[PDB]
Amino acid sequence: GNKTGITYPEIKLGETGKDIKTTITFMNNRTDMNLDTYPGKNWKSYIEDFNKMYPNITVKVQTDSNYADSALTRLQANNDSWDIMMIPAVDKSEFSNYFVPYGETSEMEKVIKLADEKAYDGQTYGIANNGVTAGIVYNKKVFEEAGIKELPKTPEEFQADLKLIKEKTKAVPLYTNFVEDWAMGAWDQYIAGNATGDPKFMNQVLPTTKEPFKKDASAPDTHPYAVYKTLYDAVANGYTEEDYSTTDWESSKGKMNNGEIATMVLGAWAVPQMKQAGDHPDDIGYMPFPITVDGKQYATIAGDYSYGINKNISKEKQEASMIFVKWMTEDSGFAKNEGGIPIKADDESMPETYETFSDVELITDAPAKEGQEDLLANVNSDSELGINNGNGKKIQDIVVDAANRTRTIDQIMDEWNQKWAKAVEDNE
């Protein structure tokens, strides 16, 4: 797919491509950063900084509120109307049908983190925008008002804390952001490394296990079941917003900052957005998801959204785009600014958000065994469950079922297991 003859490690920022005069279109999900009133460093500011180094590469930013859906639509049009996008929910095995390979994955791992996350048949097709963990954003002042002494570490402790918040404060204990598909889909981010302690769970165990959503007999407070039951119980116990059908994401930021919401299950990228949303940044904290595995808590570090380059575009625009991605990765400061972990391989600096995480084991998803790279994507597709790959609708169903008492969490998990179990069988 690479028309340029140049791999990503071969780019010398400030020297390579300096003769290029072109314009590239950069599609991303950060509508907030596409505004002049963004409380932080917005897209225009980054592009200005980039243009000091490459003045003749003009970068045009396009942002969509319904990002996942609109990016996939543009991808399936198979044209040259975009040059860089954040990779949406695409089968790894289909990367080469859409995206320029940055380079051999073994070479990329020398210069970026998470080089095998968006890779296939030995090539890397996406670079993460920053490394994030999945945890819980919480308001420390609301927790103090509720009398919560220590952060909850099990589902039972969490529900006990939500009840204290409900009874003793005025905050919504857990705000679901039901209306945002991506906010509901985020619950899939906790069910593997966080809920099991096993870096191989996501890419090896899950797609080879017929009923992964069943309760774990030995440790019923762990594994994916415990995650989805956390959401189920919080809604069924009356510890979420009165009306899930009318939640609002943008106002939820200000409400967290001002102590009207106590918790939201979101990745670390959300911490600066909550802190910027009002006068009480110091009241925003970040905690591990409340599962303990054999006495230890775990948090997976993963890419939030990865940059991919359109294989359909000219060699000039492919190279211009790869220069901008490398600039974003190595020079921009995006990760330092959005509260995430830098992706340049040799940068071991960490957001200050990781201070309730001193005893947490930070892990990354191991690749599948050789030849199984595509197994999760294929079981996911055939099951129609879209685990960690776009499907927030099934999580909305958890909220609906728990609020209307139509089904128990067991029954919901049993439905998923039967669909997954067939997909595991069909792909073995």
Ligand X SMILES: OC[C@H]1O[C@@H](O[C@H]2[C@H](O)[C@H](O)[C@H](O)O[C@@H]2CO)[C@@H](O)[C@@H](O)[C@@H]1O
Nearer CB in complex with ligand X: 269/416: 269
Residue sitting closest to ligand X (CB): 32
Torsion-angle region of 370 (φ positive above 0: left; ψ -120 to 50: alpha; else: beta): beta
If one counts every other C-beta atom within 10 angstroms of the C-beta of residue 237, the result is 15
- 46 lies in the site for ligand X, by CB under 6 A: no
Contacts of 385 (CB under 8 A, 6+ apart): 391, 394, 416, 419, 420, 423
- 200 lies in the site for Zn ion, by CB under 5 A: no
Q: Which does 377 bind (CB under 5 to 8 A by kind): ligand X, Zn ion, none?
A: Zn ion
| CB distance 140 to 117 below 8 Å | no
Q: Measuring CA to CA, how many Å separate 90 from each of 82, 120, 122, 140, 359?
A: 17, 12, 17, 38, 35
Out of 32, 83, 283, 330, the only residue in the binding site for Zn ion (CB under 5 A) is: 283
Dihedral angle computed from the Cα positions of residues 160, 229, 199 and 308, in that order, rounded to the nearest 10 degrees: -110
Number of residues that bind ligand X (CB under 6 A): 12
Looking from the CA of 215 toward its CB, the CA atoms found within 13 Å total 11
For residue 135, which amino acid is it? G
Closest CA to 154 of 361, 23, 350, 294: 294
Binding mask 265-284 for ligand X (x = CB under 6 A): ----x---x-----------
Closest CA to 345 of 6, 112, 170, 122: 112
Nearer CB in complex with ligand X: 143/305: 305
Out of 161, 233, 304, 319, the only residue in the binding site for Zn ion (CB under 5 A) is: 161
- 67 lies in the site for ligand X, by CB under 6 A: yes
Out of 49, 64, 91, 331, the only residue in the binding site for Zn ion (CB under 5 A) is: 91
- 280 lies in the site for Zn ion, by CB under 5 A: yes
Nearer CB in complex with ligand X: 57/184: 184
Q: Which does 279 bind (CB under 5 to 8 A by kind): Zn ion, ligand X, none?
A: Zn ion
- 38 lies in the site for ligand X, by CB under 6 A: no
Q: Which does 56 bind (CB under 5 to 8 A by kind): ligand X, Zn ion, none?
A: none
DSSP state, residue 376: H
User: Can you read off the two tokens belonging to residue 193?
Assistant: 């490394």
Out of 8, 32, 82, 291, the only residue in the binding site for ligand X (CB under 6 A) is: 32
- 188 lies in the site for ligand X, by CB under 6 A: no
Least distance to ligand X, CB of residue 108, Å: 22
Number of residues that bind Zn ion (CB under 5 A): 18
- 41 lies in the site for Zn ion, by CB under 5 A: no
User: Can you read off the two tokens belonging to residue 128?
Assistant: 């993460």
Q: Which does 273 bind (CB under 5 to 8 A by kind): Zn ion, ligand X, none?
A: ligand X
Nearer CB in complex with Zn ion: 228/324: 228
Out of 51, 65, 78, 411, the only residue in the binding site for ligand X (CB under 6 A) is: 65
Mind spelling out the 3-state secondary structure of 309-369? EECCCCHHHHHHHHHHHHHHHHCCCHHHHCCCECCECCCCCCCCCCCCCCCCEEECCCCCC
Q: After which residues is the chain broken (C to N over 2.5 A)?
A: none
Burial of 323 (C-beta count, 10 Å sphere; 0-12/13-18/19+): buried
Classify 160 as helix, strand or coil. Answer: helix
- 31 lies in the site for ligand X, by CB under 6 A: yes
Out of 30, 140, 141, 223, the only residue in the binding site for ligand X (CB under 6 A) is: 30
**Considering only 23-31, 139-147, 213-221, 227-235, which stretch makes contact with ligand X by CB under 6 A?**
23-31
Q: Which residues within the stretch 365-384 sit at the binding site for Zn ion (CB under 5 A)?
A: 374, 377-378
- 252 lies in the site for ligand X, by CB under 6 A: no
Least distance to Zn ion, CB of residue 415, Å: 5
Rounded to the nearest angstrom, the gap between the alpha carbon of residue 91 and the centroid of all alpha carbons in its chain is: 16
Nearer CB in complex with Zn ion: 19/352: 352
| CB distance 191 to 291 below 8 Å | no
- 117 lies in the site for ligand X, by CB under 6 A: no
For residue 269, which amino acid is it? W
- 304 lies in the site for ligand X, by CB under 6 A: yes
Residues forming the site for ligand X (CB under 6 A): 29-32, 65, 67, 182, 249, 269, 273, 304-305
Residues forming the site for Zn ion (CB under 5 A): 65, 69, 91, 93, 104, 121, 144, 157, 161, 180-181, 279-280, 283, 374, 377-378, 425
